[model samples]
Target: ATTLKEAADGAGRDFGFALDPNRLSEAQYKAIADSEFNLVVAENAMKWDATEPSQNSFSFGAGDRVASYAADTGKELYGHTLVWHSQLPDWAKNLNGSAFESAMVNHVTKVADHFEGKVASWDVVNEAFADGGGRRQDSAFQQKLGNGYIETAFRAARAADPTAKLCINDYNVEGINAKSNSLYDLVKDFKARGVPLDCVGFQSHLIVGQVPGDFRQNLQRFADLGVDVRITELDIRMRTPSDATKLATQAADYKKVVQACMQVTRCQGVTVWGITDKYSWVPDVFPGEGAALVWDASYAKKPAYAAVMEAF
Candidate 1:
C-alpha cells in the first residue's frame, strides 16, 4: 500500500488541512507547506468576529497574513466562514429585524469580496439548523432574522463572488441522522429555487470507537443531490495520553472516514482540523479528552495517519 501522501498524489485531487494563524511559526508554516496537504483551511482565520470584530471597522491583518503565506507557497486556500452563529461579535448580534439582516449582508459581501478569487471555496453558512427541526433557535441570526437568513446569506455571497464555490458547513451531520437529513431537505429546497450552493461540507469530527455507520451512504446521498461534498474538519478523539488500544481504534475510525469519502465521487477532499494533537482545540473545548490527530505533539506519524494512508 502507498503512503497517504503517495495515494493522495496519485488521485489528482488536493489534500487539505486547517492552519491556526495564532499558533503558526515560520518553521511550522514551512513544515505544513511540505506536508501531504496542498489545500489549507484557515481555522478561525476568516470568522466574522475575527476579521471585523467591530461595527464599521474591519481588520484583516491576521487573515491577510495567512492568505499571503498560502499564496506564496502555491497552496489552495479556503475561507472558513462568512456567517456562523458562534464566534460572532457582540455588536453585530445585538441588532434587530432588518437591521440585523442588513448588517449580515454587508459583512458577507465585504468578507467574500475581500478574498474573492484568491480563496477557492467559502463556508457561506455554518450550523444554521437545529438537529430536530427548524433553524437553531438560540443563534443570533435566528433570534433576529428568523429562518430565512440562510438563503439571504447565500444570495449575498453569490452576489459578492459568483465564481467561488459556496458551501454549507456543519458538524455532527455526516450520516443519516436527523441533523444531516434536515440539511438535505434544505439543500433540496435551495436547488428548487436555484440557490447558488456548490457544496455541503461534513465536519467529520468522530470519536475513537464509533464511526458513523452510514458514512458512505451519507456522502452518496449528498452527491446524488448534484452538488459537491467534502470532509471539512476530520478528526478522531481518544482517551487522553494515548494507549495502544485507543490508538488502534482511532486508526480504524480515521480509515473508515477516509474510505467513505473515497467511495463518493462528489466528496471533494478531507481536511484534518489541525496537524498535531497538541494544538487541537478539542482538548481545551471538550476538556479531559485528548489525542485527536494523525500526528502527536512531537510531529511523529500516529497509527491513525498510517491507517488513513492505507485507506487511500
Candidate 2:
C-alpha cells in the first residue's frame, strides 16, 4: 500500500492523526489527511476551552468543521476530550463545590450528546494522574469533586453516547512505570466497581529511540483487564536539524510502536499527534526539538512513514 490508511486497512486497525481545524483550508494538508488517515481527532477544537468557553454557553463551530470533514471523507471521528485540567476557560477553572460537579456533568453530557454517533470514541478524561503517581492535585476536578470526578465524567459520557467508546487518556503511560501503575490501579478499580470505562489511551509521546521496551506487555496487561488500549497522541522528537541518523532512529522507533500494537489483540491502533513536522507540537513545547511526524515540512513522506507502513 502507498498510504498509511491502506496499510492500516490491511492490518484491521485505525490509522489516524490529530486534525488542526485551521489547516483544513490548505489543499495540500487536506489532501494528505484525507488520503492517509482513517480516523481523525480534533487537535484542540473539542477541548473544554473551545467547547464551553462560558458558563452553560456551548460552541461546536470548529469541532463541527472537523466532524463534517471526517464524515465527508469517510473517516472515523475520535473526540479528543470531554474533560481536562489544561486549556480550561477561567470560568471552569475557578468553579468549586456543587457548581464544579454540575458543570462537569453538564460539559461531558452536552459535548458527547452533540457528537453522538459522529465520533467513534472519546478521551472522556485526560491527565487526571500526576507524572510520578497519584492524582494531579492541581486539577480543578480533583480539587473540588475528588476522585469521583473521573467516574462521573465516564458515566455522563456513556449516558450521552452509549455507542461511542469512552476512554481515559494520559501521557507517559507507554510502559509499566509509576504513572502507568497509578492508571492501571484506577482502571482495575473502575472495572471492579462497574464504572462506564471502555478503553485506556497511552499518550505515547516519546523521545527518539525511547519507545518503551515493555510497551507491548504494558498494553496486554491493560487489555487483560477487559479494556481496549490505544497509542493516542504518539510522537517521537529529536534535537533540531535532524540528520540521517536521527531520521533512521525515528523510523525504527515508529516501527516498534506499530509492531507493539500489532502484537496486542485489543490494541485499537495508533494516532500520530499530527500529520506533518511543519505543524508538530514538539518544537513549541520542547525548544530545539522537532521533526516528530511521518511527513516533513514540504509534505514529503519521511522514513518514519515507510516504517509505519512496513509494520502493518
Candidate 3:
C-alpha cells in the first residue's frame, strides 16, 4: 500500500500521527494526514494546561480545531490526555482540600462532555507514577488526592463518555521491568475491582538501536489483563546530522517498536510523536538529538518510514 494507514489497516491496526495545529494548516500535512493516517492524537492541544488554564474557566480553542479536523476527515480521534502533573495552570497548581479533588472531577467531566461521542478514547490520567514502580510523590493530585486519584479520574471520564475507551498513559513501560510490572499489578487489581481502565499507552520514546528485547512480551502480558495497549508517542532519536549507518539503525529501531504493537492481538495501534522531523520535539528538548520521525524536514521519507511499512 502507498500510505501508512492502508498498510496498518491491512494488518488490522490503526496507523496515525500526533497532530499539531500549527502544521494542520499546511496542505502537505492535510494530504498526508487524510491519505496516510487513520488515527489522530493532539500533540499538546488536549493537555491540561492547554485546555484549562484557569480554575472553572476553560480553553478549548486549540483542541477544538484538531477535533473538528478529525471529525471532518473521518479520522479516529484518540484524545491525548485529561489529567497530568507537569502541565498545570497556576489555579490548579495551588488548589487544596476538597476543592482540589473537585477540580479534577469537574475538569474531566467538562472536557469529556464537550468532546463526548467525538473522541474515541482518552489518556485519563498521565504519568502519575515515577519510574521505579512507585507513585510520583511530586504529582499534586497524588500528593493531595492520594493514590485514589487515578481511580477517581477514570470514573469521572467514564461517566461523561461511556463509549470512549479510557486509557492510563505513561512513558518507559514498553518493556517488562519494575516500573511496568508495577503497572501490571495495578491493571490486574483494577480489573478485579472493576475500574474503568480500558487501555495502557506505552510512550516508546526510544534511543536509536536500543529497542527493548522483551517489548512484545510486555504488551502481551497487559493484553492478558483485558486492557488494550497502544504504542503512543513513538520516536527513535539519535544525534543530529545522521550518517547512512545511523539512519539505518533508526529504521531498524522503528521496525522493532511497530512490530511489537502489530504482533500483539490486543495492541490497538501505533502513533509517532510527529509525522516529520521538522516539528519533532526531540531536537528542542534533547538538543543535538533529532531526526526521530519517519519523515524528514522537507516531507521526504526516511528509511524509518519504509521499515515501519515492512513491519506491518
lDDT of 3 by residue, 60-159 (tens): 9999999998889888999978999988888988999799999999999999999998889899988877898888888889888888889989999999
Q: Residue 175 of candidate 3: its Cα lDDT?
A: 82
Ranking by lDDT: 2, 3, 1
> Model 2 compared with the native: what TM-score?
0.99
Give me candidate 1's TM-score against the actual structure.
0.96
Clashes per candidate (backbone, < 3 Å) = 0, 0, 0
Question: What is the C-alpha local distance difference test score of each model?
Answer: 0.85, 0.93, 0.90
Task: For model 3, state the Cα shift of residue 155 in Å.
Answer: 0.8
TM-score of each: 0.96, 0.99, 0.98
lDDT of 2 at 150: 92
**Residue 251's lDDT in candidate 1:** 89
Q: Candidate 2: minimum summed lDDT over ten consecutive residues — where? A: 91-100
Total clashes for model 2:
0
Name the regions of candidate 1 deviating beyond 4 angstroms. 1-5, 26-29
Candidate 1: residue 126 lDDT (0-100): 92
lDDT for position 296 in model 3: 89
